[PDB]
Design a protein around this nucleic acid. Structure first.
Lengths: 93, 209
RNA sequence: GGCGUCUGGGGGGAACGCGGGGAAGUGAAACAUCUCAGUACCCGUAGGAAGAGAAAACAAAAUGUGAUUCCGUGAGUAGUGG
RNA sequence: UCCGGCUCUACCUGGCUGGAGGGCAGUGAGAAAAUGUUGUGGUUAGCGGAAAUGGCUUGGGAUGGCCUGCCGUAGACGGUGAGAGCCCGGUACGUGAAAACCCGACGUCUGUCUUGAUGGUGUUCCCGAGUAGCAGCGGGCCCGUGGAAUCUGCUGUGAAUCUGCCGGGACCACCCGGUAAGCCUGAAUACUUCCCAGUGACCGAUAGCGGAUUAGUACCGUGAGGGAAUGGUGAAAAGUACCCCGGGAGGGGAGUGAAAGAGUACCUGAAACCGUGCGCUUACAAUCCGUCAGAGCCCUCGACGUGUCGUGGGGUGAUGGCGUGCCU
C-alpha cells in the first residue's frame, strides 16, 4: 500500500487531521489502515472506545525528521532489492 | 492581402508571411458554415443505440390463452408492445449520421472561418513552438501567453513537429491540428490560430496552387 | 470367410462455405401459371476461411483485352411476365 | 566441367547410368520429414513514473469559495467523508521473460540441373471416349418452350486428333477467338462461441439481455417446451450499552450519529386507499352533484376605537335561477 504495519503516519484529512500515529493493522484489500489514537469510536459493549479503519489516502508516511512525504522506490543494484525512500529528503524510510 | 509577421520563441520578429486574399479575405457565410459544422458533428456522432422490437425479444411465440370465454382482452402474444417487458414499437436502431456535403461548400466554409479569424488579426505565425529536441510545457505556455491572452487557441504544426506537439499537448485550452486536417469546427471553436511557418506555407501551397 | 498384428475413424461447436432435398401463411384485392423463394427447415461435409481460378474466354473487324474472386457503375436498363 | 560404370560380346564410332566440383530451389501450389544458432522480434506475469500535510472561511468531513505557489512528453479516467493535475490507483513516457508458444534469419538437411545447350530442313504418329454431338423428358440462365443459343441431370444413340473439334443467342457459308472430355494454386472476400483494449448527443431496476438480486433459477407441463419476481441505511456499524411497559412483537426514556423527518420493515417518499383533531354545514327532503346570485358563521390583511368599513382576500355555505357524464 506504500504504507505498512508498524509504520508511523500523519493524518492529512478527516476529523483527526494533523494527529500523528502508528499503523497497527493494514488492509490491502480495503485500502484502509488502523492507526493509534485516530478515528476512535464509541461502541456499546460499558461503552468502549477504540479506533476504526481509516482510508489510506488520508495518511502520509512521516519522515525521520517528522515531515510527511510521498514515498518513492529506489532499486538496490547490488542485490536486486527495492526499498522505500522519501521524496522530501531522499533518505531511507 | 494581409500581412502576418513571424514571431520566434526568443521573442524577436523573423519575417513575414503574405496571406492571399482568396484564402484569408472571403466574406464569411453564416448559413454555409453552420451547415458544414452541423454535418461535421453529425459525422462525429456514432449511432450505437439499439432496442429489441416485438420480434427480437425472448419468447412470446405462442398465443397465451383462450380468446373467448375468459372475459378478458384478446392478446396474440406476451411480447406485444402494450405488455410490460414487451417489444419496442419505434425504438432507436443503429444508423449512420454522416452527410455528403460537397467539397466546394467545405472549402468555402473553412476559407470563411479563416478570413473571419484573420480580419480581427487573430492569426499568428511562429517558427517553432519551443527550442527543439526536448518538450517543455513551461516554455510553450510562456510563448503562447506572449502571443495571446485568449482562453482557447488552435496550434497548426506539421506532423513532423513532435517537440511542439508534445509541448503544447497538456495545456487546458490548446488544441493541436495538422495543416492538412484543418476544418471549420476546429477553427471556429478557437479564439486564436497559431500557425507554424512551414505549416502555413504548406497550407497556402496546397490550396492556392 | 477366419486368425494375428499396426495405423486411422466415431462425438461437440455461435456465425461464415460448398453440394443436395425443399414448403406454406402471403401478393396477385378471388386463384391454379407466377410470387413468396430456392426463403424457412432438413441432409452430407470442411476450412481458418471456403468455393472459383489459368480460356475448347470475351470482343467485333479496334493491327482490341488477356486466370479467378470481391466492391462501385452499367441499371431498375435491354428484356422477361395469366 | 572432370572421373566412372553400362548400351548382347572385344575392337574405331552415337545414346543410357553413377561419383567429385559448380550452381538452383525448399517445408512453399510448384516433393518431404526433421535438427541447431540467433532477433530488446511478438504474445503469455509486472516495475518505475513530476508537482501542496499551503493560508483564511463554511462545514461532521474540503475534493466548495477567496488568495498563494509547483509539475506538465503527465489537465485520460476512477477512488478518498461534497467539483482534486500536485492524497491514492494511475496517465504521458520508459523499462522486463527463467520457461512455453508464434513469427523471421542464417545453417545442417532435402531434392534438383548439369549425358548438356542453340538456332534450322521435309515427311509418318500423338494431343485426355461411352466423351463431344444428336433425340426424348427436366433444371437454371433477363429468357415462364418460345425461332431458343451457352451450361447441366436421367434414358437411348454415339465421332473424330489439327484441311480435328468447340464458341461468336435458331441455322448455313466466310472470317475471328479458343484448344473440352486430367489435377493443384496464395492475396484481395464472409463471420465471431472465445480472449484483450476501448468507445457511445445508447438504458438506468415496469428500462437495458429472459436474467444488476438463488436465472434459464423458482414454478408450470408426462414430454418437446414455457418461464418469472426481488437493486440504494450510514462516511464509517459507530446496527441503539443501560432502565421501564410487555410472554414476545412493539414502544418510551438513555445513548451513537451532522441528521434516527437515516433503526438492518432503513436515500428521496407522490397518487390511489385508510385514520385522528379543528372550523362551517346537514334529520319536511326528489340533488350528471356543478355554475351564477347569495343570508349566516369562522379566519385573515389595512384604516379609524372600544366595533365598523374596505379598489380587500379566504373556508363552509341555508336559499333562488340554470343545467340530459366522457369516448367511439
Amino acid at each position: 500500500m506504500k504504507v505498512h504495519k508498524g509504520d508511523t503516519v500523519l493524518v492529512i484529512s478527516g476529523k483527526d487531521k494533523g494527529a500523528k500515529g502508528k499503523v497497527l493493522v493494514a488492509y490491502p484489500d480495503r485500502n484502509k489502515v488502523l492507526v493509534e489514537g485516530v478515528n476512535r469510536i464509541k461502541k456499546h459493549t460499558g461503552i468502549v472506545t477504540q479506533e476504526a479503519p481509516i482510508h489510506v489516502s488520508n495518511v502520509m508516511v512521516v519522515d525521520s525528521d517528522g515531515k510527511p512525504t510521498r514515498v518513492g522506490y529506489r532499486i538496490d543494484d547490488e542485490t536486486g532489492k527495492k526499498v522505500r525512500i522519501a521524496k522530501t529528503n531522499g533518505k531511507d524510510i | 492581402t494581409l500581412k502576418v509577421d513571424v514571431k520566434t520563441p526568443a521573442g524577436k520578429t523573423d519575417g513575414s508571411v503574405e496571406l492571399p486574399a482568396e484564402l484569408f479575405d472571403v466574406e464569411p457565410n453564416i448559413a454555409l458554415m453552420h451547415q458544414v459544422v452541423t454535418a461535421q458533428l453529425a459525422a462525429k456522432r456514432q449511432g450505437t443505440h439499439s432496442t429489441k422490437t416485438r420480434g427480437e425479444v425472448s419468447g412470446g411465440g405462442k398465443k397465451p390463452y383462450r380468446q373467448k370465454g375468459t372475459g378478458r382482452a384478446r392478446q396474440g402474444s406476451t411480447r406485444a408492445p402494450q405488455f410490460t417487458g414487451g417489444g419496442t414499437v419505434h425504438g432507436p436502431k443503429p444508423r449512420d449520421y454522416s452527410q455528403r456535403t460537397p467539397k466546394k461548400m467545405i472549402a468555402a466554409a473553412l476559407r470563411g472561418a479563416l478570413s473571419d479569424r484573420a480580419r480581427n488579426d487573430r492569426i499568428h505565425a511562429v517558427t517553432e513552438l519551443v527550442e527543439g529536441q526536448t518538450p517543455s510545457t513551461k516554455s510553450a505556455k510562456t510563448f503562447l501567453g506572449t502571443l495571446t491572452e485568449n482562453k482557447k487557441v488552435l496550434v497548426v504544426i506539421g506532423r513532423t513537429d513532435e517537440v511542439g506537439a508534445k509541448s503544447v499537448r497538456n495545456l487546458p485550452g490548446v488544441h493541436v491540428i495538422s495543416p492538412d486536417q484543418l476544418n471549420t469546427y476546429d477553427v471556429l471553436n478557437a479564439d486564436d490560430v497559431v500557425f507554424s511557418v512551414e505549416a502555413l506555407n504548406a497550407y497556402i501551397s496546397a490550396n492556392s496552387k
